[PDB]
Design a protein around this motif. Structure first.
Motif, mmCIF file in Angstrom:
data_model
loop_
_atom_site.group_PDB
_atom_site.id
_atom_site.type_symbol
_atom_site.label_atom_id
_atom_site.label_comp_id
_atom_site.label_asym_id
_atom_site.label_seq_id
_atom_site.Cartn_x
_atom_site.Cartn_y
_atom_site.Cartn_z
ATOM 1 N N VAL B 296 0.901 -1.271 0.034
ATOM 2 C CA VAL B 296 -0.048 -0.084 -0.073
ATOM 3 C C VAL B 296 0.818 1.300 -0.172
ATOM 4 O O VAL B 296 1.655 1.571 0.934
ATOM 5 C CB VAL B 296 -0.968 -0.050 0.974
ATOM 6 C CG1 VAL B 296 -1.411 1.281 1.578
ATOM 7 C CG2 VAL B 296 -2.016 -1.149 0.948
ATOM 8 N N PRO B 297 1.044 1.993 -1.341
ATOM 9 C CA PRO B 297 2.224 3.056 -1.223
ATOM 10 C C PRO B 297 1.912 4.104 0.073
ATOM 11 O O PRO B 297 1.112 4.343 0.529
ATOM 12 C CB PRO B 297 1.346 3.744 -2.516
ATOM 13 C CG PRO B 297 0.528 2.807 -3.248
ATOM 14 C CD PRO B 297 0.230 1.589 -2.565
ATOM 15 N N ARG B 298 3.064 4.569 0.509
ATOM 16 C CA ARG B 298 3.206 5.144 1.655
ATOM 17 C C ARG B 298 3.392 6.627 1.291
ATOM 18 O O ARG B 298 3.640 7.329 2.358
ATOM 19 C CB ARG B 298 4.631 4.782 2.208
ATOM 20 C CG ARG B 298 4.637 3.083 2.473
ATOM 21 C CD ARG B 298 6.185 2.844 3.353
ATOM 22 N NE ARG B 298 7.206 2.638 2.340
ATOM 23 C CZ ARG B 298 8.341 2.520 2.327
ATOM 24 N NH1 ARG B 298 8.642 1.868 3.344
ATOM 25 N NH2 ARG B 298 9.310 2.656 1.445
ATOM 26 N N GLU B 299 2.953 6.831 0.275
ATOM 27 C CA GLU B 299 2.776 8.417 -0.238
ATOM 28 C C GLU B 299 1.545 9.111 0.640
ATOM 29 O O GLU B 299 1.456 10.084 0.914
ATOM 30 C CB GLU B 299 2.481 8.660 -1.699
ATOM 31 C CG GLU B 299 2.230 10.102 -2.054
ATOM 32 C CD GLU B 299 1.208 10.209 -3.239
ATOM 33 O OE1 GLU B 299 0.882 9.196 -3.808
ATOM 34 O OE2 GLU B 299 1.399 11.164 -3.946
ATOM 35 N N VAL B 300 0.648 7.963 0.968
ATOM 36 C CA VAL B 300 -0.619 8.268 1.884
ATOM 37 C C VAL B 300 -0.337 8.597 3.127
ATOM 38 O O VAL B 300 -0.999 9.381 3.563
ATOM 39 C CB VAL B 300 -1.707 6.711 1.538
ATOM 40 C CG1 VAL B 300 -1.872 6.531 0.219
ATOM 41 C CG2 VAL B 300 -1.150 5.757 2.217
ATOM 42 N N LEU B 301 0.374 7.691 3.907
ATOM 43 C CA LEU B 301 1.052 7.899 5.201
ATOM 44 C C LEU B 301 1.765 9.056 5.356
ATOM 45 O O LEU B 301 1.618 10.099 6.191
ATOM 46 C CB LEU B 301 1.587 6.599 5.932
ATOM 47 C CG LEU B 301 1.989 6.791 7.057
ATOM 48 C CD1 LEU B 301 0.693 6.820 8.081
ATOM 49 C CD2 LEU B 301 2.890 5.641 7.390
ATOM 50 N N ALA B 302 2.700 9.568 4.324
ATOM 51 C CA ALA B 302 3.142 10.728 4.205
ATOM 52 C C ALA B 302 2.510 11.727 4.183
ATOM 53 O O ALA B 302 2.506 12.731 5.264
ATOM 54 C CB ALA B 302 4.434 10.489 3.077
ATOM 55 N N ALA B 303 1.704 11.841 3.328
ATOM 56 C CA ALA B 303 0.821 12.874 3.155
ATOM 57 C C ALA B 303 -0.121 13.014 4.532
ATOM 58 O O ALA B 303 -0.398 13.963 4.621
ATOM 59 C CB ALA B 303 -0.378 12.533 2.035
ATOM 60 N N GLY B 304 -0.538 11.981 4.900
ATOM 61 C CA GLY B 304 -1.171 11.800 6.347
ATOM 62 C C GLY B 304 -0.697 12.850 7.507
ATOM 63 O O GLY B 304 -0.854 13.464 7.922
ATOM 64 N N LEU B 305 0.730 12.246 7.454
ATOM 65 C CA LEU B 305 1.678 12.949 8.709
ATOM 66 C C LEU B 305 1.630 14.378 8.046
ATOM 67 O O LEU B 305 1.525 15.336 8.994
ATOM 68 C CB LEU B 305 3.098 12.084 8.894
ATOM 69 C CG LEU B 305 2.958 10.928 9.728
ATOM 70 C CD1 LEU B 305 2.745 11.648 11.252
ATOM 71 C CD2 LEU B 305 2.028 9.885 9.246
ATOM 72 N N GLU B 306 2.159 14.534 6.915
ATOM 73 C CA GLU B 306 2.314 16.065 6.430
ATOM 74 C C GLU B 306 1.068 16.636 6.905
ATOM 75 O O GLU B 306 0.818 17.950 7.434
ATOM 76 C CB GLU B 306 2.334 16.063 4.973
ATOM 77 C CG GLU B 306 3.758 15.962 4.374
ATOM 78 C CD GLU B 306 3.843 15.875 2.752
ATOM 79 O OE1 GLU B 306 3.528 16.762 2.319
ATOM 80 O OE2 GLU B 306 4.170 14.844 2.555
ATOM 81 N N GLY B 307 -0.181 16.182 6.603
ATOM 82 C CA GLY B 307 -1.627 16.818 7.139
ATOM 83 C C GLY B 307 -1.545 17.246 8.625
ATOM 84 O O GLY B 307 -2.171 18.432 9.004
#
Ligand code: B12
Ligand code: B12
Ligand SMILES: C[C@H]1O[C@@H](n2cnc3c(N)ncnc32)[C@H](O)[C@@H]1O
Ligand SMILES: C[C@H]1O[C@@H](n2cnc3c(N)ncnc32)[C@H](O)[C@@H]1O
Lengths: 327, 327
Positions: B296-307
């Motif tokens: 599951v691409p970790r762009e999502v979690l990164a983006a999540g943390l970012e947010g």
């Protein structure tokens, strides 16, 4: 010497976590040729229900129940160690509903099945939907039994039934959420319903022998009822924010208890709507009202809470209006 | 042979729910004069951790683990049925931390103690604070042992320690959340810390013999760290609302992400609370690799943390440096 008459001595020991004399009773009945099904139903389940009722009446704490539930699990373990191996081929997978942590419902059911010579794998408490179907696939499960202890778990039982159908597998459901007949079960697309092992053994043995057709068309459910499910958090947490600007200020414990009750309220309401049975919501109001009454917390709080939910609840599901205008 | 060398055959059976041969190994070792403590630590706990790691590597499902965990509970039950009664007076109450459902940590610990002749009541999984203290009071517990498997449970362990102190009761803590030494434990006001039963037996037997002084002063904790704990849900759910206006997700994926972000804020808050950066850093490493094996691409979690960034520092500006440490 009926299992029922041993509830009180069993509980005396179980409530303080004194496993050994309580499992001894269980095993004494078994050795005196009492069927296991009866031991499970008339002593262990009956005791566990009484524990729950005493908690409910604020006569026991969760600490007492935790000990009682451990003794119950130890009794089931003792009983399982006495069983002969399965006489029937064909694996039945018993699962609590997703979100449901009453492992003992699944375990008591599954053990009664074992005592009828079924090969049974009890997953017990909440498992991801996709992990259950994948298990059915890998373990070559004949049948899924879903044990559901509260009607707030229904959306996921429906989804789970659907996933099981996609892989050819039939689902029986039961436990207290489904009531005394098959109407709630049928409304969710279950292939069957039963009250206990005796009946479920017939259905299951039948599914082993003749593996039945299963829809693969999902059972229709009210979308507004599902949207109201999904929003339960939002509505509760947002109801509690207002109310504490400040019409009742409430410590961090009380705010959390209230919040938690209002999430439940919206989920019982949603469940009532989903399977078109008003009594689910009406029984919840009776239930919660008396929960609080033995705990000496004025019910202006909950009333105020329900009051607050009103406008937002009907904004999501206007069909809940009529359910609310009894209370 | 040594208990340790039986992990693999134990697991072979336990992971598929084949209780009987796996419990039999535990009882065969016991008949061969192997101390229970060793059986529990070297076979049962060891196996359960390996189950954990296989899950973590996405080589097992929660369904397989649920089976393994049932077998472990049944092993402990079998072993418990072989024990003589307590040789020592003075009741030890063993509890998982509030919020923590790893009953087996408390149970394995408590059972090793039993095997050293302690009188032990294992409450196991999460109990309300006030119910634990009321049990201590009613049962005349000498000592509270709190078992904590994640650091996100620390605020409530602190509160629990405080309630126990109010009634003159000493608290030892343990479980994997407290690490390899007593620093996290001490920071929450625990009266003691140990790695396993052998050490805890010395401390506890000492508390029975010489009943120690207990601070009626709460251990100091940073309020901003606690407010960040309290807000975890809001921040996660609100972060996920933005992000789905629309930077990328089905109902399953939105829920998984949301759940991971609640965890993120809680590990961050926990790291801040007990002033140990590594709690948050270890979590990032942990979760990053959890998702990597699951494709599951970790762009999502990164983006999540970012947010999370903007809201998190708005609540606790002291978290800024911990966040910028990461990436
Ligand atoms: C112990 C217990 C728990 C334990 C469970 C521990 C464990 N290892 O199972 C814990 C502590 C987890 C717990 C938590 C909670 N629970 Co609870 N608790 C119980 C208790 C006492 C049930 C324990 C039990 O042993 N059940 C096993 C037996 C007794 O169940 P049974 O129904 O007799 O099972 C038979 C039949 O149903 C049938 N059957 C069962 N399953 C199936 C499946 C199929 C396919 C078929 C054919 C048949 C079948 O066969 C069985 C034969 O033995 C009940 C009391 C009750 N059930 O009346 C509540 C009860 C279910 N809990 C309740 C509540 C409210 C809670 C909590 C919300 C409390 C809270 N935290 O604030 C949480 C919810 C947790 C969750 N999300 O699931 C309420 C529900 C009330 C309501 N719905 O309005 C109950 C009824 C207590 C009460 N008020 O009287 N609970
Ligand atoms: C089985 C399991 C579960 C089961 C537990 C069921 C049960 N217990 O009946 C269930 C399904 C409930 C579960 C759920 C979850 N868990 Co889990 N799971 C585990 C596992 C495999 C527990 C195994 C177990 O049997 N524990 C008992 C044994 C192995 O513990 P032990 O640490 O050796 O205990 C000894 C010592 O610590 C010491 N000790 C223990 N307590 C005490 C207390 C005192 C006072 C003292 C002095 C000493 C002491 O003595 C003990 C005896 O030798 C672990 C893997 C692991 N622990 O590495 C995770 C693990 C703890 N779980 C984890 C996770 C993520 C989850 C979930 C979040 C999953 C989810 N929801 O997505 C939830 C959290 C639930 C919650 N707690 O609120 C992670 C935690 C990761 C982290 N970063 O902290 C772990 C580590 C798995 C992993 N490798 O990632 N889990
Ligand atoms: C239904 C059963 O759940 C238990 N119970 C009620 N509230 C909680 C809670 N917050 N945490 C854990 N168990 C609880 C009680 O012991 C009751 O009997
Ligand atoms: C940490 C342990 O918890 C289990 N696990 C992971 N995710 C869930 C979930 N959503 N529900 C129940 N159990 C879960 C796995 O079996 C793992 O080993």
């Amino acid at each position: 010497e009926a299992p029922a008459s041993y509830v009180e001595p069993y509980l005396g020991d179980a409530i303080v976590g004194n496993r050994r004399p309580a499992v001894r009773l269980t095993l004494d009945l078994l050795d005196h040729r009492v069927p296991e099904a009866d031991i499970v139903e008339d002593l262990l389940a009956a005791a566990q229900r009484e524990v729950g009722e005493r908690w409910y009446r604020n006569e026991l704490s969760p600490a007492d129940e935790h000990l009682a539930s451990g003794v119950a699990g130890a009794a089931l373990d003792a009983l399982a160690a006495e069983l002969p191996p399965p006489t029937r081929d064909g694996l039945v997978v018993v699962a609590c509903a997703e979100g449901d942590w009453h492992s003992l419902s699944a375990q008591m059911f599954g053990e009664t099945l074992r005592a009828s010579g079924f090969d049974v794998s009890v997953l017990g408490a909440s498992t991801p939907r996709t992990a259950v179907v994948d298990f059915l696939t890998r373990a070559g499960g004949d049948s899924l039994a879903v044990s559901c202890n509260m009607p707030i778990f229904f959306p996921g039982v429906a989804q789970l039934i659907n996933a099981a159908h996609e892989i050819g597998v039939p689902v029986i459901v039961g436990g207290r959420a489904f009531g005394d007949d098959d109407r709630r079960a049928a409304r969710l697309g279950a292939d069957a319903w039963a009250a206990g092992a005796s009946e479920a053994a017939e259905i299951l043995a039948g599914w082993h022998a003749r593996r039945p057709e299963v829809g693969s068309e999902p059972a229709p459910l009210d979308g507004a009822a599902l949207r109201l499910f999904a929003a339960s958090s939002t509505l509760a947490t947002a109801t509690v924010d207002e109310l504490t600007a400040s019409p009742i200020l409430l410590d961090a414990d009380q705010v959390d208890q209230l919040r938690e009750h209002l999430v439940f309220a919206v989920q019982f309401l949603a469940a009532a709507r989903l399977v078109d049975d008003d009594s689910i919501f009406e029984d919840f109001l009776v239930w919660i009202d008396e929960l609080l009454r033995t705990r000496d917390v004025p019910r202006e709080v909950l009333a105020a809470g329900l009051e607050g939910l009103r406008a937002k609840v009907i904004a999501v599901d206007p069909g809940a209006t009529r359910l609310l205008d009894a209370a």
